[PDB]
């Protein structure tokens, strides 16, 4: 079935560059927009950006730019989220979800990638 | 002109959501003016009257509100014109030199309506506001009501097209066709039914205005 | 960014209760909104997309409604599994924003 | 002697469905067979001769109004002074009514005497 | 709107006629006269009518930029200029030989080229008439593999911010029956963003309903565009007419 | 003396397809060539002079009526009187009949005398 | 004595919503209940009897004009002379005014006496 | 003395392209400049004065009808009596012809004297 | 004494934009506000009284004709006898001109006297 096998939790140094892979399996990954949402341990959701794998088009939330650079690899159907300056505020779970259509809800999400600083 | 108006029975949300659609594909203008292609006859007109004068909309509403069978309300839909909104006079003047003929009853009608026929369907992007026309029976007035202004009205800097309606088919040298008209000699293409109402969901019952021949009523009020 | 909010941060409602959760937007997003259910540990599961289109293969007890800047995810007969956080997320503009999160209770 | 007198009956919400013209007693006349705008009611036939009855002066101006309204078919309140004609083949053909005045009608209010 | 125009779809694949005859004799029967067709989607447009002359108007289409060459194609006599604007597409990318033509009555102020995600698929070339868009496609004859991706790319492109108000309408030889295309756009496409429009009877001498169109639901009055099938023409499959439901 | 007299033959379901206006014996007149609504029957031509026949008083009210029905082209029941005009070149041109009264015709029933 | 006398009240921007035609004291008449084009004001009921008041000579031309403006419904500037009729029921029915003329109206300026 | 007399030339299939109304010698009149339906022929200008020529009694009827056929623009066979007006400037302006009667026209045959 | 008399000014390509009927000196009248079809020129007004001027006989023939050319708003050529009305409040309202005759107008040729 259509699922998004995320990466395992990762604990980071003070302000390094971390990578959060999102293995998209069960559908044509090159056809849909892969999104990225961060939700603090108790806060609401915050969508970071998107990535059009066919053309690599990217749209961010205009505030994660300096701390998130989306990128995918059509081969293996995986979406990588290179986050920079992993401050203590960036300690949260980052979800990846396939957007059915451009500017549409996100049908399938990932289990989550709990990132923490220490 | 700058903003043409059209009276309809569909609530403002329905129009701001769907807008006004054509009645069909018949581009025969001589039929439209005479109301043959509008709700009167074949009901396949490819235009929408959209009178410019607010007075005509009141007359349109008064034509409806002044019937013992019309129950629903009636609000005016201020419609912004664009490059696709065409008047009559440029379109008639062209259909005349092209061999066509518009008998003085049609010219009589077209002068009173000040029509600005929309060759294309009026999208909600153009409809600016809908003025719910209330009617005081005891006085016969058509007063304005809550003017629910459209939300997605794209206030483009456009005006009516003073050119000739494109794709006007060959006209008929002489028609003698029943010029359908309702109320105070208003063209039949202003009726609620002059635009298709196949909106999403249960189609609210649209009033079936019984039109009349404009030729006689015209010829009667001129002579004698 | 057309932010969004949920006036009810904890829509305390017992079983079998008609749990309608509000959502206000900062701009007309008519027919363009998403309701995601998120258990305490599970991931956000899309329930409603657009105006009221219920996700294929989901319980019919849920129900969406509203347009413009107001919306309402109706839950006729609540359930323990259905007692979780909900997020209304507009997608009318490229900066996406989710609701405040109306974590249900009893 | 006025169309609005209590002796002249009025039929509101009427539309002139049919219209007739001719001559009788060497004088033109016109009879209107009106029906309710909603098709209900009973056929109300109203006549008027150009020289017979006291309402003759208005003939030239009622016929033009009956003809006008007939062309438009709009609701109108026709006023009739009942039992004014006696010619058997005339009263039995159209009616005994005698159109004394027409008046445009709105949805509920009929502008005219009642 | 879409019902605003007499939109039609057709393919030039005939296997028994000339490559340019149907353009001159058959397509004309559909376009000539106001009772004809407004927008005709001509697939397998190996070449535009010789009687047409290129207009030279450069086009910077949206989406993926491919050379789109517009022609002026008079239909009536030299006196009554029944001018038609053929928006053709021949050579775009290594997946050459598009052969998609969109002939319309009025010139298009915008032209759209929506290359689907597949690599061997044909670009979705469409015209833009004010607030209306009319796209066409020609999927692969191996069962409409990119047919789903052909319609999805169109949706994804017209959900954009500036391309949202438009009322687009994709129609071509999807090579995949509606029940099969509507199957590829149901698992996740749960909002019913598009309402497939296909005729009742088949649309090919041997095939099924390969020829049809699809209109975005959110577009105004999309429910009016009913897909009827034009009588048999010289091509291999009928032309699908997209008129408006009577009122 | 009445347009509905049994001595005046009436033609129902008629429509005035052609209308002529002229003068004869220093008095205006008009002739209406009526054909059946469904194109059946024979063209019934009915005339009326302003100062010739006993139906002169109604000419003013008939020409205007004929001119009205001739405009809307609706089904009408014209009432003509046979053998009224005697001018040789006239009867050979239009008819020997003389219009004496018209009436609107609905789908089935032609309101008027008969 | 003229339609534009300072003593003749004129109501511009009106439209003839209803038009009554009847008879009073053996004389045709017609009353027009005109309403403001923009729904403002109050309905102005104006009459013109054919033989009663000094405005009788204009009746045949007012009725034929009021009918034309009532038919078209275009904006007009009716002129009236208040308190002209004395019949209690009449003035109680239509008004005490007396239509002394009509005039076409453009967008802003109504061509006529003001 | 009749619109259909052999001396009253008739121009068939014409349509009234223009219609002028004025006054001449303390009497109204009108002149209709008719052209063929297919643009062929020559403009047939036919005048009619209310009291000057022997066709006076028909003016009020020809005008009311010539205006109609001019309004409808339908093909009509207007009957003219050449060389009936004598005023120099008049005959030079419109024509020497004098309208003696109009007539409606069918596709091929015109209902009227020929 | 004729609408084409050189002492009468003719305004070509005009369209009757506004038409006003009234009464003056116990005599009906009507004034037309004629503007150039292309909106150019100046408002050319012309009146006509039923009993005042020498052009009175053609009043009924011009009111109903002006009403016709006013309804169609077609290009017409109006003829005026300037300086004919002396009533102070009248000449200041509409004009001193007196409509003596109307005329339809083609693209370039205004059929009528000039």
Q: Could you tell me which residues come within 8 angstroms of residue H99 by beta carbon, excluding any fewer than 6 positions away? A: H31, H32, H46, H47, H48, H55, H62, H66, H78, H79, H80
The count of other CB atoms within 10 Å of the CB of residue A12 is 17
For residue E187, which residues of chain C lie inside 8 Å, CB to CB? Answer: 56
Cβ contacts of H33 on chain I, cutoff 8 Å: 111
Cα nearest neighbour of B141 on chain G: G39
The total number of residues shown for chain F amounts to 114
How many helices (H) and strands (E) are present in chain F, helices listed first? Answer: 2, 5
Residue E34 to residue B121, Cβ atoms within 8 A = no
With an 8 Å Cβ cutoff, are H105 and F18 in contact?
A: yes
Please give the Cα distance from D53 to C61 (Å, whole number).
Answer: 77
Chain Cα centroid distance, residue I44: 8
Measuring CA to CA, which residue among H95, H62, H92 is closest to residue H78? H62
What region does B112 belong to: left with phi over 0, alpha with psi -120 to 50, or beta? Answer: alpha
Residues with Cβ within 8 Å of residue D46, at least 6 apart in sequence: D31, D32, D34, D78, D80, D95, D97, D98, D99
Q: How far apart are CA A102 and CA A54, in angstroms?
A: 13
DSSP one-letter string for D4-21: TSTTSEEEEEEEEEEEEE
CB within 8 A of E16, min separation 6: which ones? E234, E236
For CA atoms G93, G97, G101, G104, the dihedral sign is negative
In terms of Cα–Cα distance, which of E39, E160, E131 is closest to B80?
E131
Chains G and F touch (3+ CB pairs under 8 A): no
H/E run at residue G11: strand G9-23
CB contact at 8 A, H81 and H9: yes
Q: Which residues contact B17 (CB under 8 A, 6 or more apart)?
A: B124, C30, E220
Residue D5's closest chain G neighbor by CA?
A: G89
* Partner G, chain I 32-61, Cβ-Cβ below 8 Å: 33, 45, 50
Touching pair H, D by Cβ (3+ pairs < 8 Å) = no
Give dist(CA D40, CA D18) in Å, integer: 15
Beta bridge pairs of residue I46: I32
How many C-beta atoms lie closer than 10 Å to residue F108's C-beta? 6
Contact E42, E93 (CB under 8 A): no
Cβ-based neighbours of B170, under 8 Å, separated by 6 or more: B98, B99, E80
Query: Which residue is closest to A1 within chain E, CA to CA?
Result: E187
Q: d(Cα I30, Cα B33) in Å, to the nearest integer?
A: 30
Token digits of residue A117? 């600083």
User: Chain C residue with minimal CA distance to A111?
Assistant: C43
Give the per-residue SS3 of chain H.
CECCCCCCCEEEEEEEEEEEEEEECCCEEEEEEEEECCCCCCCEEEEEECCCCCCHHHHHHHHHHHHHHHHHCCCEEEEECCCCCCCHHHHHHCCCCEEEEEEEECCCCECCCC
Chains H and G touch (3+ CB pairs under 8 A): no
Query: What is the 3 state secondary structure string of chain E?
Result: CCCCCCEEEEECCCCCCCCCHHHHHHHHHHHCCCCCCCEEEEECCCCCCCCCEECCCCCCCEECCCCCEEEECCCCCCCCCCCCEEEECCCCCCCCCCCCEEEECCCCCEEEEECCCCCCCCCEEEEEECCEEEEECECCCCCCCCHHHHHHHHHHHHCCCCCCCCEEEEEEECCCCHHHHHHHCCCCCCCCCEEEECCCCCCCCCCCCCEEEEEECCCCCHHHEEEEECCCCCCCCCCEEEEECCC
Q: Which residues contact B84 (CB under 8 A, 6 or more apart)?
A: B118, B119, B120, B161, E130
Q: Tell me the chain B residues in contact with residue F72 when contact means C-beta distances shorter than 8 Å.
A: 178, 213, 215-216
Say whether B59 sits in a helix, a strand or coil. helix
Residue H102 pairs with which residues in a beta bridge? F21
Rounded CA-CA distance G12/G10 in Å is 6
Rounded distance between C-alpha atoms, residue H63 and residue H80, angstroms: 14
In this structure, the number of other CB atoms found within 10 A of the CB of residue E161 comes to: 11
After what residues is chain F interrupted, C–N > 2.5 A?
none
Residue that is written with structure tokens 């909603």 in the block: D38
Mutant choice from F65, F73, F74, F102 vs B, greatest count of B C-beta within 10 A: F73
CB E228 within 8 A of CB E243: yes
Strands B85-87 and C70-75 come out as: unpaired
Q: How many CA atoms lie within 13 A of G86 on its CB side?
A: 2
Rounded distance, CA I4 to CA H90, Å? 8
CB F113 within 8 A of CB F79: yes
In angstroms, what CA-CA distances link E173 with E15, E96, E112, E211, E237? 16, 17, 18, 5, 10
Instruction: Give the residue extent of every domain in chain G.
Output: 1-114
Do H57 and F19 make contact, defined as CB atoms within 8 angstroms? Answer: no
| B214-222 helix and H59-72 helix, angle to the nearest 10 degrees | 140
Interface test with C, best of E185, E190, E195 (most C CBs within 10 A): E190
Phi/psi for D73 (5° steps) reads 65, 15
Distance CA B46, CA B39 (A): 12
**Distances in Å between the alpha carbon of F84 and those of F55, F101, G84?**
10, 14, 50
Q: Distance of CA F4 to CAs E67, F70, F111, Å?
A: 81, 21, 12
Sign, CA torsion B159/B162/B163/B166: positive
Backbone angles phi, psi at B149, to 5 degrees: -75, 140
- Residue A102 three-state SS: coil
Pair E2, E167: CB distance under 8 Å = yes
Q: Are D75 and D37 in contact (CB under 8 A)?
A: yes
> Which helix H or strand E contains B89, and what residues bound it?
helix B89-97
Inter-chain contact F100–D22, Cβ cutoff 8 Å?
yes
Pairing state between β H76-80 and H10-23: antiparallel
Q: Residues of chain B whose C-beta is under 8 A from some C-beta in D?
A: 65-70, 135, 137-138, 140, 183, 210, 212-213, 216-217, 220-221, 224
Judged by a CB distance cut-off of 8 A, whether residue C27 touches chain B is: no
Q: Which residue of E has its CA nearest to B196?
A: E247
Structure tokens at H93: 């302006």
The minimum CA-CA distance between E17 and chain B, rounded to whole Å, is 31
- What are the phi and psi torsion angles at H59 (to 5°)? -55, -60
What is the DSSP track for chain I? -BTT-TTSEEEEEEEEEEEEEEEBSSSEEEEEEEEETTS-S--EEEEEESSSSTT-TTHHHHHHHHHHHHHH---EEEEE-SS----HHHHHHS-S-BEEEEEB--SS---S--
C-alpha E39/C-alpha G13 separation (Å) is 47
CA distance E175 to F107: 53
Q: Report DSSP letters for F64-114, one per residue.
A: HHHHHHHHHT--EEEEEESS----HHHHTTS-S-EEEEEEBB-SS-B-S--
Resolution (A): 3.1
Q: What region, left, alpha or beta, does residue C57 occupy, with left being phi > 0 and alpha being psi -120 to 50 degrees?
A: left
**What domain range includes position C87?**
1-106
**Distance between the two ends of chain D, CA-based, in angstroms?**
15
Q: Cβ of C46 and A106 within 8 Å?
A: yes
Nearest by Cα to E199 from E185, E187, E188, E210: E210
Query: Of C46, C49, C54, C51, nearest to C30 (Cα)?
Result: C51
Distance between CA A105 and CA C34 in Å, rounded? Answer: 5
CA pair distance B216, D64, nearest whole angstrom: 12
Q: Where are the domains of chain B?
A: 1-224
CA distances from I99 to E205, F56, G2 (A): 74, 34, 18
Written as six digits, the tokens of G67 are 């009918």
Residues of B in contact with D14 (CB under 8 A): none
Contact B15, E221 (CB under 8 A): no
Q: In whole angstroms, what is the distance from residue B63 CA to residue E201 CA?
A: 45
Q: Which residues, in sequence order, are CB contacts of G31 under 8 Å at separation 6+?
A: D111, D112, G19, G20, G45, G46, G47, G48, G94, G95, G99
Q: Report strand pairing: E132-136 vs E167-173.
A: parallel
Chain H partners (3+ C-beta pairs within 8 A): B, F, I
Say if residue E231 is exposed, middle or buried (CB neighbours under 10 Å; 0-12, 13-18, 19+). Answer: exposed
Distance in Å, alpha carbon of A52 to nearest chain C alpha carbon: 13
CB atoms within 10 A of CB G68: 27
Chain G residue with CA closest to B110: the answer is G72
DSSP state of B21: B
The minimal CB distance from G39 to the residues B141, B217, B222 is found for B141
Interchain proximity E221–B84, CB inside 8 Å? no
């Amino acid at each position: 079935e259509v699922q998004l096998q995320q990466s395992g939790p990762v604990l980071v140094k003070p302000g390094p560059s971390v990578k959060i892979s999102c293995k998209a399996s069960g559908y044509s990954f090159i056809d849909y927009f892969m999104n990225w949402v961060m939700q603090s341990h108790g806060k609401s959701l915050e969508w970071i950006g998107r990535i059009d794998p066919y053309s690599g088009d990217t749209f961010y939330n205009q505030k994660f730019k300096g701390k998130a650079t989306l990128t995918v690899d059509k081969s293996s159907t995986t979406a990588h989220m290179e986050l920079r300056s992993l401050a203590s505020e960036d300690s949260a779970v980052y979800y990846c979800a396939r957007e059915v259509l451009n500017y549409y809800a996100m049908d399938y999400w990932g289990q989550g990638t709990s990132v923490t600083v220490s | 002109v700058d903003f043409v108006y059209r009276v309809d029975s569909t609530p403002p949300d329905v129009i701001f959501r769907d807008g006004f659609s054509l009645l069909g594909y018949n581009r025969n203008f001589q039929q439209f003016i005479s109301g043959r292609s509008c709700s009167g006859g074949s009901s396949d007109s490819r235009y929408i009257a959209t009178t410019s004068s607010v007075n005509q909309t009141y007359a349109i509403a008064r034509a409806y509100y002044s019937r013992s069978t019309f129950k629903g309300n009636l609000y005016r839909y201020q419609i912004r014109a664009d490059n696709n909104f065409y008047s009559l006079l440029p379109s008639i003047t062209y259909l005349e030199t092209q061999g066509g003929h518009f008998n003085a009853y049609e010219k009589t009608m077209m002068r009173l309506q000040r029509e600005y026929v929309s060759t294309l369907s009026i999208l909600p992007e153009n409809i600016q506001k809908a003025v719910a026309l209330v009617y005081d029976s005891a006085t016969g007035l058509v007063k304005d009501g809550v003017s629910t202004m459209n939300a997605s009205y794209l206030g483009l800097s456009t005006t009516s097209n003073p050119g000739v309606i494109p794709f006007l088919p060959e006209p008929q040298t002489y028609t003698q066709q029943r010029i359908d008209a309702f109320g105070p000699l208003i063209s039949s293409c202003f009726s609620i039914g002059s635009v298709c109402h196949s909106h999403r969901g249960q189609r609210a019952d649209v009033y079936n205005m019984s039109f009349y021949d404009a030729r006689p009523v015209i010829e009667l009020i001129l002579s004698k | 960014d057309i932010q969004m909010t949920q006036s009810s941060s904890y829509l305390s409602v017992s079983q079998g209760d008609r749990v309608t959760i509000t959502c206000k937007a900062s701009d007309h997003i008519d027919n363009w909104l998403a309701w995601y259910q998120q258990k305490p540990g599970n991931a956000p599961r899309l329930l409603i997309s657009g105006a009221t289109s219920l996700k294929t293969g989901l319980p019919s007890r849920f129900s969406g409604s509203g347009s413009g800047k107001d919306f309402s995810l109706s839950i006729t007969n609540l359930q323990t599994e259905d007692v979780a956080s909900y997020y209304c997320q507009q997608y009318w503009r490229t900066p996406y924003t989710f609701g405040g999160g109306t974590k249900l209770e009893i | 002697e006025w169309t609005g007198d209590n002796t002249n009956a009025y039929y509101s919400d009427e539309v002139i469905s049919e219209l007739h013209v001719g001559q009788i007693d060497t004088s033109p006349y016109f009879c209107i067979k009106t029906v309710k705008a909603n098709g209900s009611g009973t056929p109300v036939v109203a006549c008027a001769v150009s020289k017979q009855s006291i309402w003759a002066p208005s003939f030239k101006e009622l016929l033009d109004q009956a003809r006008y309204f007939y062309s438009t078919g709009q609701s109108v309140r026709i006023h009739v002074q009942k039992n004014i004609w006696t010619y058997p083949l005339f009263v039995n053909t159209f009616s005994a009514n005698a159109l004394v005045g027409l008046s445009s009608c709105s949805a509920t209010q009929c502008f005219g005497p009642k | 709107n879409i019902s605003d125009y007499k939109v039609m779809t057709w393919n030039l694949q005939g296997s028994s006629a000339s490559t340019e005859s149907k353009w001159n004799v058959n397509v004309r029967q559909l376009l000539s006269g106001t009772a004809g067709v407004d927008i005709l989607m001509v697939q397998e447009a190996g070449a535009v009518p010789t009687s047409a002359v290129p207009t030279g108007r450069h086009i910077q289409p949206f989406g993926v930029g491919i050379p789109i060459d517009e022609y002026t194609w008079n239909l009536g006599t030299t006196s009554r200029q029944d001018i038609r604007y053929i928006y053709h597409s021949a050579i775009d990318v290594g997946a050459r030989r598009v052969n998609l033509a969109i002939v319309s009555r009025q010139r298009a102020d915008n032209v759209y080229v929506l290359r689907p995600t597949t690599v061997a698929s044909r670009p979705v070339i469409g015209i833009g008439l004010g607030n209306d868009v009319f796209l066409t496609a020609h999927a692969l004859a191996s069962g409409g593999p990119d047919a789903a991706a052909i319609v999805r790319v169109t949706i994804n492109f017209f959900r954009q911010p500036q391309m949202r108000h438009l009322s687009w309408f994709l129609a071509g030889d999807f090579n995949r029956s509606p029940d099969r295309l509507e199957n590829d756009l149901m698992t996740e496409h749960l909002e019913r963003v598009v309402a497939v429009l296909a005729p009742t009877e088949p649309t090919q001498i041997g095939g099924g309903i390969l020829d049809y169109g699809v209109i975005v639901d959110r577009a105004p009055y999309s429910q009016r565009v009913e897909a009827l099938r034009n009588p048999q023409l010289a091509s291999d499959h009928y032309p699908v007419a997209f008129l408006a439901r009577s009122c």
